[PDB]
Design a protein around this nucleic acid. Structure first.
Ligand SMILES: [Zn+2]
Lengths: 364, 140, 63
RNA sequence: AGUCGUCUCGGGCGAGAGCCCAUAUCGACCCCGAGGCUUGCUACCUCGCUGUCGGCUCUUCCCAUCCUGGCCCUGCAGCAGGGGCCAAGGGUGGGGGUGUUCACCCAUUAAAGGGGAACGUGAGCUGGGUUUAGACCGUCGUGAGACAGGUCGGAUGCUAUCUACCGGGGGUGUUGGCCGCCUGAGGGGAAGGUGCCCCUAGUACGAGAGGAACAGGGUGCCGCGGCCUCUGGUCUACCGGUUGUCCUCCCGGGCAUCGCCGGGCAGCUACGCCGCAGCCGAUAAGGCCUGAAAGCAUCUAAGGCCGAAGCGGCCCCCGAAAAUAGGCGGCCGUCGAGGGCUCGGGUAGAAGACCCGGUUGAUAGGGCGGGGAUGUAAGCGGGAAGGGUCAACCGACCCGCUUAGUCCGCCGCCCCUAAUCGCCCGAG
RNA sequence: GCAUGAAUGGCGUAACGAGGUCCCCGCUGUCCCCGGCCGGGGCCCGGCGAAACCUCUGCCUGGCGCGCAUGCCAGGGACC
RNA sequence: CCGACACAGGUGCCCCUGGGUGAGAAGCCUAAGGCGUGUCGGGGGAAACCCGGCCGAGGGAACUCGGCAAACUGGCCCCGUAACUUCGGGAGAAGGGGUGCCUGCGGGUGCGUAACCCGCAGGUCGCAGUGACUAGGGGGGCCCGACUGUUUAAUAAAAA
RNA sequence: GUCGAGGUCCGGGGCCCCGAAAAUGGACGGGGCUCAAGC
């Protein structure tokens, strides 16, 4: 007989092409009864480690253990749109979408330069860097009529879902000015309840503390670090050819048999590696910190920023998340998180674990 | 419960790196009669195509005796690895490494053949094989 | 969560890093970095380097 | 290629062997087949060339199933065995001699299955065997010489025309143009597979020896997708030591693989670390209920309930060229929304493309500060084994000013400098 | 001794050999299992500027066929 | 000059060679002399892959027809050196220790405190002192041919 | 010995069923067809 072995690489992530957009998309949402927005967004900052008393079931329960964590900076999101979905012939179809009128912006870090007063920024100016075509002469009265029409459609019952359109605020943390516009689902079983939940916070700011719970599992969605064009040895993990090969060692030997008289798509080849849309499952949210600081035991507060700052990143100044393990993406990449969609049967308790040490030493 | 005091095997919370492949030479750290052994296999291990079986601290391997007493040479024995040169991480995150690659000859059930163990014995191996830790003089 | 002390430079290093070396006679050494470990094993004198805690003792002995 | 004598695999009958008992198991003598995986037979295609065996690399398929999932009979007490049924999602490994396929052997393992793809794969590799030209031995021949007899040596060419697959771009169409957010028709997945330990339990069973299972916990290995906090490798950025020579000597430099050696942050990596649902629905073998044909009986003829690692869904990746060529909000047209080149840089990169910034300014440089890497600079003062007219002076090296000096493909603050000017397309 | 043998020499042999062959210490990326770095190509821009080769063309599954079809039959799919 | 060429071949390297290190006409640096014409340039974290080179944790031939390739050793001085033997050899067998710089003495030849060479004592620095360069890995059986030498210019260097 | 209408056997004829396992995905020419669009 011959020798058997599993094939090189997985066919479940094909085509291995560049991501359609740098902003991740979410295809599936968890089913929940609590009325809350199902996820959040942030920017990847860096990695560090802690020592914590383990609370998850297993052999090392109750013993102090090492744990790598990733810090994700999450300035509050701006809720500025509401979208309604009806049931079409082949799936959900959006029926209407209402956004709030322009309002003054107060969290913009304006600075006095030589001459001229404060810039006095307003909304629809930062949003213009993403949309570029915003309503003109839009008034609170017209916004109220549109919201009333959407509500009337909900009462009639043509609407089967409602979602919240939010925008990031990188100018708060001084990362950049162009925001990311995303759509988020709201848990619950009542369309009216979801609509009221979105309406009460239209035009407002939402913080990660009001959304997510410490110690719960999450799914992390991002675009992985790009590697450019890579050969089959790195892309699919094939074996190097024999050292006596005079035509090269980092290539596939045979790319197919005589019949079929074509190259099958399953043969490993060089191509784009990295910068792929990926989803990671069951990452625990260790802790949530406010204003770049983490409280430990009601009398100690530490700065999560390591000495000298995060490598290739500034200083954390806003609310942040501590995610156990590693997350896909590069530094400053936009990261989306949602409640875990397939959690294990025996999940860890929904509370912050006992933390005994947090590393804040220089990471460069 | 079963095998209350007669148990021979234990559980360790730390999994040392498998840094000793097939064909490695280990020093026998007890007075069983053998001095140097060579790994020819690892039990409770499944490999893959063209992959050599590897083992680390606290692992039982099949070895052949290369140096020792004439009644022990050219014999196929079972040995538990107690010291390895390659560093491995513990629960607190610190790495630990030893001075040499040392093993203790035991029966297939885990009962040591010798009467005393010479040199330090790794904590992971000591908890994995209770009989070894009983006769070990230094545990680290 | 206890800071260990390097056996070469004499300084404390944070939990979760560093390494521990065990000699065949049971003595235990702690190394904060591969640099300190390599210097200790190659035999560089720690009493001549101003960045080592042993340098203070050496200078006290020399007066 | 045709054929199946032969080969591999089945079936019909039942002489019997099994303490009685043909069918738990083996099944004589005969008889009927399937496959094209052994060999042979024919000489139908190919001699103005279709490059061989074995091995390595890589992809895929069949079931006559080796293990994993579920069952039936037993001459099945348990632990195990023998025979058979459904089932191809996954696995089926490492070594010794030999060119070997095969076969034999070793230590593990759940098992270490048989085959097809031009005896898959030389415009992918290697060239050990075979099958030229050189040579030796044995045998045969008067001889030249020969041997499906051994033996040593004996070359592997390529700028891709079309198509194929992997990734990357410009267009047209989608009944006017543009920006943003979505839907998911269809395609792909193994994204998971499989051991062991504790307990049940020294319990059921069994005279004893021995010795389960449901449920409940823990963990290893193989496979897959990510990351650089820890560890390790590299680090021709950088820092230090040192040899030969040259720039006259000091400092500071060139060359000698980065001259060599030790350390080394960022980056890249693995030997490092993190993540990978068991539930629902219909079924195969099989176990049953009701029930007549056939007043009884009967799992089947009609009907009904359960029942697999197998099928469909939940999950993940691609996805408006999905020709029924989609939905919604907004801006624009019947001068003009929007965009491109140019500008400063990378969360990106072979060209394209993509992403941030562009005075609505901290994008890069520069200045200052933080953090880090080496390891205490030049200069001066002193000491130094000794020499020296035991004077002056020379002297490797050591101590103090000195956590110094040098450097940073990391961070923060400050508009001082450059992100300017300009050009072009564009629906009607 | 299928089928060795004594000048088509027999047996042995120190020294010698880029001859064939087996083993041991040491050594190592041959391998487990591959990962970094440097210089030259590859890639893009400005120039000089060919050749081998070429019936016309050129998507697949099952078939018929001089018995292994891009072009034939029935189906499938495919904008350039 | 010949090879169709402003051809990496051959004819002709045919005759000659300052300084330092060093046994050296070796390697490396450098003076004189010559050249930038072994003649297409520019860009780039601008990839995959190929050719040439450096390094690689733990293991150490488990790779493979076969340790192919690579790696170890390496100069000099002093101890020490086996089987066998044609007594010449094997042999640099094997194996072990040392090696820089500074200070000062002693010795050989020498008229010389000129030049070359050989020792001694002390001090001291580094992971490493033949620090770059130059520069053997070693041992034990068997077959064949005694040896040095010759051969199929263009697939066989051999036991022929 | 009680019910109280056809059962018992054999040899044949027509259609159908079991016997009936293969390798790129696929062959009644295809779609499909059941008092047929089969015999
Ligand atoms: Zn240290």
């Amino acid at each position: 007989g011959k020798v058997h072995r599993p094939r090189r690489g997985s066919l479940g992530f094909s085509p291995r092409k560049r991501a359609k957009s740098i902003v991740p998309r979410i295809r599936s949402w968890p089913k929940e009864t609590e009325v809350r927005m199902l996820g959040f967004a942030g920017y990847k900052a860096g990695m560090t480690h802690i020592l914590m008393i383990d609370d998850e079931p297993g052999l090392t329960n109750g013993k102090e253990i090492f744990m790598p964590v990733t810090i994700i900076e999450t300035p509050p999101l701006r809720v500025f749109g509401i979208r309604a979905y009806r049931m079409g012939y082949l799936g959900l179809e959006t029926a209407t979408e209402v956004i709030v009128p322009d309002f003054p912006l107060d969290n913009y870090p304006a600075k006095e330069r030589k001459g001229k007063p404060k810039p006095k920024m307003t909304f629809y100016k930062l949003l213009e860097r993403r949309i570029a075509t915003l309503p003109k002469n839009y008034t609170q009265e017209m916004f109220e009529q549109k919201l009333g029409q959407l509500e009337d459609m909900i009462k009639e019952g043509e609407i089967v879902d409602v979602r919240a359109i939010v925008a990031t605020q990188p100018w708060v943390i001084k990362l950049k000015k162009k925001p990311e516009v995303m759509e988020y689902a709201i848990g619950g079983t009542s369309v009216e309840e979801k609509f009221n939940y979105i309406k009460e916070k239209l035009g407002k700011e939402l913080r990660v503390g009001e959304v997510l719970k410490e110690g719960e599992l999450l799914d992390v969605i991002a675009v992985t670090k790009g590697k450019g064009t890579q050969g089959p040895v790195k892309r699919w993990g094939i074996k190097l050819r024999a050292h006596k090969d005079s035509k090269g060692r980092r290539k596939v030997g045979s790319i197919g048999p005589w019949h079929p008289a074509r190259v099958m798509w399953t043969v490993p080849m060089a191509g784009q590696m990295g910068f792929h849309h990926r989803t990671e499952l069951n990452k625990r949210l260790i802790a949530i910190g406010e204003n770049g600081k983490l409280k430990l035991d009601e009398n100690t507060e530490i700065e999560i920023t390591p000495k000298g700052g995060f490598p290739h990143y500034g200083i954390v100044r806003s609310d942040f998340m501590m995610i156990a393990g590693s997350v896909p993406g590069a530094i400053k990449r936009i990261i989306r998180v949602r409640p875990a969609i397939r959690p294990p049967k025996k999940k860890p308790p929904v509370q912050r674990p006992q933390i005994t040490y947090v590393s804040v030493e220089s990471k460069q | 419960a079963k095998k209350g005091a007669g148990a021979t095997r234990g559980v360790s919370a730390v999994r040392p790196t498998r840094a000793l492949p097939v064909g490695a030479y280990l020093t026998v750290a007890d007075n069983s009669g053998a001095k140097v052994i060579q790994i020819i296999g690892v039990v409770e291990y499944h490999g893959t195509r063209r992959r050599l079986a590897s083992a680390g601290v606290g692992d039982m391997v099949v070895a052949t005796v290369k140096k020792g007493r004439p009644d022990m040479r050219h014999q196929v024995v079972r040995a538990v690895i107690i010291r390895q040169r390659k560093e491995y991480r513990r629960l607190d995150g610190m790495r630990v490494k030893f001075e040499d690659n040392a093993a203790v000859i035991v029966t297939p059930e885990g009962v040591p053949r010798g009467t005393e163990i010479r040199g330090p014995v790794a904590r992971e191996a000591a908890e994995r094989w209770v009989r070894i830790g009983s006769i070990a003089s230094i545990i680290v | 969560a206890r800071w260990n002390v390097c056996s070469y430079c004499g300084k404390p290093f944070e939990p979760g890093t560093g390494k521990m070396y065990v000699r065949n006679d049971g003595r235990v050494l702690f190394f904060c970095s591969r640099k300190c470990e390599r210097y200790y094993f190659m035999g560089r004198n720690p009493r001549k380097l101003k960045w080592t805690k042993a340098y203070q003792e050496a200078r006290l002995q020399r007066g």
